[PDB]
Design a protein around this nucleic acid. Sequence first.
DNA 1: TGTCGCTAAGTTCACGCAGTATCCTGT
Lengths: 868, 186
Amino acid sequence: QVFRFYWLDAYEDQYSQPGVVYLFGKVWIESADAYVSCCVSVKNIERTVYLLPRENRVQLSTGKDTGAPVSMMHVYQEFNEAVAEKYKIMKFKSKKVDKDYAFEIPDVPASSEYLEVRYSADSPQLPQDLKGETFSHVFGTNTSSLELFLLSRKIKGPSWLEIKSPQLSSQPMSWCKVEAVVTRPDQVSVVKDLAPPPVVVLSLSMKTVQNAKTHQNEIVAIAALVHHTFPLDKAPPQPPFQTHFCVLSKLNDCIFPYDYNEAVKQKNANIEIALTERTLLGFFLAKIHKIDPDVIVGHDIYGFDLEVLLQRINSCKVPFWSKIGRLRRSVMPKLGGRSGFAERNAACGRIICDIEISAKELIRCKSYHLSELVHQILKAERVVIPPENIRNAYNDSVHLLYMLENTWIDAKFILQIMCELNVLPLALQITNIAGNVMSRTLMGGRSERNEYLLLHAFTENNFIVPDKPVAAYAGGLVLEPKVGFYDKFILLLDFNSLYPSIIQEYNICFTTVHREADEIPELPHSDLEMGILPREIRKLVERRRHVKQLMKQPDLNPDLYLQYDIRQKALKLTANSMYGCLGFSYSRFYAKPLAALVTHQGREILLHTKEMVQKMNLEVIYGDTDSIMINTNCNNLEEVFKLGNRVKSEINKSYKLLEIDIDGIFKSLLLLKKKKYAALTVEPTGDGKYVTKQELKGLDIVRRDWCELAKQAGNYVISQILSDQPRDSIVENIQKKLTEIGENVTNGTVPITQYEINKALTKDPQDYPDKKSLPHVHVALWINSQGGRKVKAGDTISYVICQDGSNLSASQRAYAQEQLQKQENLSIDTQYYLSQQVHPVVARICEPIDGIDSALIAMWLGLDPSQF
Amino acid sequence: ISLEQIDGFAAKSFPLCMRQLHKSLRENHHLRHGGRMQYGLFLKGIGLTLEQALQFWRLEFTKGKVDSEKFDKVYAYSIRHNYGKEGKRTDYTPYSCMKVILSNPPSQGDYHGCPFRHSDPELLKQKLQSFKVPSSGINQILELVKGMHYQLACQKYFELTHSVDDCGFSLNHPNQYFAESQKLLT
DNA sequence: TGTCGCTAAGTTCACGCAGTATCCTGT
Ligand SMILES: Nc1nc2c(ncn2[C@H]2C[C@H](O)[C@@H](COP(=O)(O)OP(=O)(O)OP(=O)(O)O)O2)c(=O)[nH]1
Ligand code: SF4
Ligand SMILES: [Mg+2]
Ligand SMILES: [Mg+2]
């Protein structure tokens, strides 16, 4: 009778079906000897509300307190007589539950005997401010059904669940191959110690042409690659994809080149030719149903792909839209809106992976277009078909097949990117650690995950969580740096997860910090036992430390090393985000005093560490809220290491948990300003041998807002300034190279691509206030004006400053690289690039180096030294 | 016309507005912009050539304890423009009494404008008495001023000072006043 | 419909303050 299945996604509708939560997942079937998708509809998820008894009777807030004691019986009578009749509540079940409370509400006793009352979801809902003569507050009123079920049953992330006495559904409700009905939340439990099962992953890529007359989008080709056993607890499979399906729709106006039949026949029989977009979409829905994918992945799928598909379904009125999800419905969710929550619910039950969002969360790149991601991870070359070439592609069958193969290659690239970044296993691990639903975890953002993590930590520990909600404080300290160049060995010490460590050490917990609703709250008493937040932060820190130690194992594959590095970075970011959510003003657990306490203790620890290091009779030169740089005044490496170990032990002697480590050793240092330096990291190899690697932190060469010409020039200049060659030869080399680059630029030898400057928009082009024509914004508007894929918010835009005789301020002349390569009346702005793009970078770089000054740089570059 | 005879005109031919402006200029050897514009346009009207006016202004301002080169640096351009030598190069006409009445209103430290309009009745009475005007003539001029007919007051002044029963002309320009005075005298 | 925090250098613009130059008004 027991029914065991591994659950992935949960979908709820607070209006259509009240008190009904769907759980989608996989279940084992021997007949097919396979895992098949199923949907279990937990019904009768009774709403719960906790009523806080008052200390004494109050005459409806009119006569104030009267002193009459109130007991549980009186509270039950009051709720049964007044509240129940007033709000049209028929049946309810009551009990007395002793619970503790520590959150942001005043005059709520820490540990009190609340009266729990449960009633059916369909009945009306109590109001938040509801107060009576016996109780002073009602909580958990708006707690969603899914949240109640998850928290109450203790389910934390995807896992194997067992169901007792399933009931077959009267009529089909979902598109899966197995349906079960659970009549109460108490019949579902979780089973531990089992292997996660394989899932089906479908990566889709669509090529679309924007309608000329209607100024809208009409899909023309859709390809997908599906793997039927993509694991989630082992390494990604090779080859990543098992099978695929391609579909192409002839344009409403253009016609095939009288050879499409023969070309398709000689190519393969796995491609579907559709006469219209309607047939194409119908075939897509049928294929999605038959495959029943569990993880649909793509590029900008949340932003532009899923939304386009749903809108096109609505526009062409393709029957059975509900198949695009897993449930069965008739009224599509209203489109538009902010973010992709509507788009997410439009395919409920099917996890969605936008490689763009995952890449933003995990890796850091100059641009997030498909080309840049492909070129930065897999190290390949991505061919971009011009938008005109697509509309004109249906003129030769050769070019039609070329476009289809380009779509296929994009799909394969997306799948390989997903595998390489290990998006799915990492998402599953993070979801299990946090506790939210996987579909939400893959959508980015850290507040949701931290909220659910603390929710679980507090619910399982007999606390009452706060109801979901319907520069600020002193932060890090940066020491004044003694800017300059250093040739001896500089030792960089740094702390390990300073903020979580502070939380652990000083017992900074929700249940310990005696708040009072911009001062710094007092430190908690030592004798208090460990709290909830310290426990969760310690669990996360322990997992991160274990992963790091595992990385330390010698003789590891470079790819596995990259995977471990990404995972460790993710865990550190998760701990840091757990700290940060304490400062979010829109967070369920906004605790500004707690974040202030954490930051204040961090500043105090940094100041004390600086004091100790100074008392050791050394020189301090820098530090950013957890790090300190020390001058050695020595040359032998062994002495450097001995001093480092000595100082490490001396510093660590004073902290119970906090650990200081040797963040690095620098042979040559170039400290320009705060948060800006370069150095030569020294990596030992054995027998005293030490290799060198150039590390830049904060320089202008490591930012996407400077031209590639300046980037390369600064890279070479720093390389020289850091080497061991004598000063005179370094200066002569710098002079020669600067003259060479000046001559090259003046003669146009440098290529076009080295001129681009990248900037990322924050809002849409229109929403930006018309405050002049800030280069990026300007170009964005131009791109929107032309007939191509739009550039929405959170997008990197590349622009090149050119010359057209505008005689306007140089900023206003920003143009697009494609424009310059196209227009015959625009040319690069040589003087701008050689004056405001190169000279400032090299001048900042060579600021503390004697022998070079702004005038010399200007002269060498070939610029006129008049205005310099 | 000669620079030296300008003073004589100031004694006799100059209308009271120009008489006040000239008196202030010789008292302080400096005139604010409005006074400068008005007096320069009037001296242009009488016939003072660009060279003559330049010499006169140079000599008068140098006594105000300012550098001669400062004069050539600053006021030379103003003079040239007043004579239509630069810029749009327009032969700007001299101010008419109506403009002077309705032009920039004088304030403390200023001496431009039509005295009949911009002088308080007591001050105008004192000034008329200073010029040895007969008490009856001063009273008649004051009555005309109180009647808002300042042009009639200036005509009465001309009649009394030139010993003519009737002016015989409708005074509507200070240069017209000077021309009539010169015709009567010369 | 939620979109972690603070700190800090840096670019582009909008304005004080002072200095230089040219251009005005009328009938
Ligand atoms: N809220 C928030 N704080 C951050 C973030 N990144 C860094 N911090 C702050 C709080 C961290 O405790 C402090 C330490 O930064 P680090 O880069 O040195 O990493 P951490 O010390 O956590 O570990 P590690 O140096 O890798 O051993 O910086 C972040 O993304 N969000
Ligand atoms: S009426 Fe004309 S001429 Fe007589 S004082 Fe007035 S402005 Fe001068
Ligand atoms: Mg650190
Ligand atoms: Mg002046």
